[model samples]
Target: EFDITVVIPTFKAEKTVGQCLESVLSQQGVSTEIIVVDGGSPDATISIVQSFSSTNLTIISEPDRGIYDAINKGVSRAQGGMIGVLGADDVYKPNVLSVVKENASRGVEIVAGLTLIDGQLRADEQYRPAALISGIPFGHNAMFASQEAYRKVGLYDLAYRICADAEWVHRAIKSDISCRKVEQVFVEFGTETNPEEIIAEACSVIQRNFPFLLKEEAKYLLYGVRGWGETSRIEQILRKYGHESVLFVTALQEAFPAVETAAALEHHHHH
Candidate 1:
């Protein structure tokens, strides 16, 4: 079996897939198998991937429901003990797999690190389970999980179009999987442009997974409040749930800067 399987879910990603695959194929000190699950892109995405002559690369092009569905398909076909999902527009940093191999060999089921986004280094924090109640603790692209974690946590839920990755992370955190945080940079992330729909979906993810934290966390998520008094209040609530040391309030502030709006709050609460 390979050391790791890197899955890339794509659509019209002709311009960036080559570089993404190049980064994965050039990984050092660990064997890697790549699976590109495309959403029947009419662009040159399939051909660009086909041009890569690596024997470990597999390409599946079909119409998928969304990014999470494509990722689910790729994960289902992975053969490595460890699995990582990379965006078509993202590229791995040098020697990322070596770090993963080192941790995996020691039985770490989940590995995550910092990510470079728009020339800024982000996710420079350890993974915390309670952070999922508010938002993703780290960059999703920077994470890798063992095949066993997949077997236990299950695949991404298809219901969430945007934040399924966050929902899956919640499951992994809630499960008995062993996780490790590496200090190295894993992947350089691409970006996004949606706020309203993303916030709505993210709130749904939190509501579905941690129902009790919906109102409190959604208030924080929507307004991005960071007052010390507010932080202590939220920490107290999280502590009640047995998360004694999660600095999720500050992490949520970093993940989502304060947006001055209570409009989304009422909408999320109504649902």
Candidate 2:
């Protein structure tokens, strides 16, 4: 059997797919299946994959419906117990797989590690599945989980272009999927050219599910746009009915805004 099955979804990412595949083929002492699922890319990405020497390579070039669809294709074709989704434009550190081996030995359901965004390495942050239910979400790049998680939670929802993965994490974790973090630089974020923020991009997927920041209302308040009610002093309003106190109490400014004050000094009350 293999140590892991890695799937890289390629779509119009010819310029960087080579570096992506190199990280995989260069690994040692592990049976790795590298599946490149291309969504009918009209680029040189496939030819780049042809240049790899690893017989463990599997390339599926067809027109798929979405990114999750492409990944689902890879999962069905995978042969290993641990599965990783490494997109074509992304990069894995030289010894990331070895570290993956280190963490996977813990028998965790999913192993999420550190990732680089625009070449800056971040902390080995872990996510709680409960956060997904509230709108905060997880990722695909730094994510490594068993195939059974997919079987139970179902594949990424094709209906969600960006949020499906987060939705999957919520469902998977809510259904008792176990996850942990590996303190290693495992993957890099990819862009059409290069990454600015993979976390932000992945987070956008969650916003697709939750849309926590109601910036539209904030915008109306900030710019004094129309359709906004007249600004009123907090004391002029009923203190008990004010949501400002509750917003401050719950520490939800990042999730909600206090339209009352620019100083962030809102009232504090309890239920």
Candidate 3:
């Protein structure tokens, strides 16, 4: 009879885990099970969880394969109908659960809201299930899934190191799961890494999951990265090829480069 569960997969996020938990603790008017799945954190991450009230919280500390593996671990323990996957560095808006509850009442298996990155809220877009056959059609953290959908689609595939969730979305779509999109910002995310490695992983995942897309669209989607500092241009290519996709999430950027770009471009223009 649980309404929703918030699953946070973590490893070495001591600095920000408190804020993440605080946002969940501040949630209003909804029954939620908060599960923190730690992949054997070598820091104070677990103690931070202990510092908070454990009323509706559960912590599972152990080694894991990766973020998706930790997420799968948390999902397996979820009793709620709706499973909200919040990252260790991601926080929720105060009314997240209430909004989700209302959307669930409308019989939507998954509800995706807007996300905030450095105070700028961006709209999360979604496409039809068929879109999954080609590219990622929604934000990973933006949507909450039903336990039933997870059971049918199956937990995330462990083989995908970086894009397992993307592959899982493909599975959900392939299984004909329903999704609802609303105009609300739910989580704020914050992240880094090698570029081609990410591009290669994304390409491989598409190849392994949806064969038809691998021949052309995978290259199309990853090629956008080549247009660094030119989101508009990259987005134009993506909008055409990747299910009308938006560019990278804020977490992927070291800082909110979009903001800095305004000044940098002004400097170039005036200079």
Q: All candidates' TM-scores?
A: 0.81, 0.69, 0.77
Order the candidate numbers by TM-score, best to worst: 1, 3, 2
Go through the candidates in order and give each one's C-alpha lDDT.
0.75, 0.63, 0.70
Cα displacement (angstroms), candidate 1, residue 264, comes to 32
Clashes of each: 0, 1, 1
lDDT of 2: 0.63
In model 1, which regions exceed 4 Å deviation?
Answer: 123-125, 213-217, 221-271
Stronger candidate by TM-score (2 vs 3): 3
| Candidate 3 lDDT tens digits, 88-109 | 8988887888888878887778
Arranged by lDDT with the best first, the candidates are 1, 3, 2
lDDT for model 1 comes to: 0.75
In model 2, where do residues sit more than 4 Å from their true spots? 121-126, 133-138, 192-271
Query: Candidate 3 deviates by what RMSD?
Result: 10.4
> For residues 1-271, could you state the per-residue lDDT of candidate 1 as single tens digits?
6999999998889889899999998898998999989888899988889899869998887778888998999999999988999999999999999899888998989988889999888734345534555556678889999888899999999988888887888777667577887777898998744887787887787666556564556556434332212443433333343232233433343343332122223223341
Task: Put down candidate 2 lDDT per residue, 44-143, tens digits, no spaces.
Answer: 8778789887588888987788889998899888887788889887877777776666667777778777777776764322354224313323346878
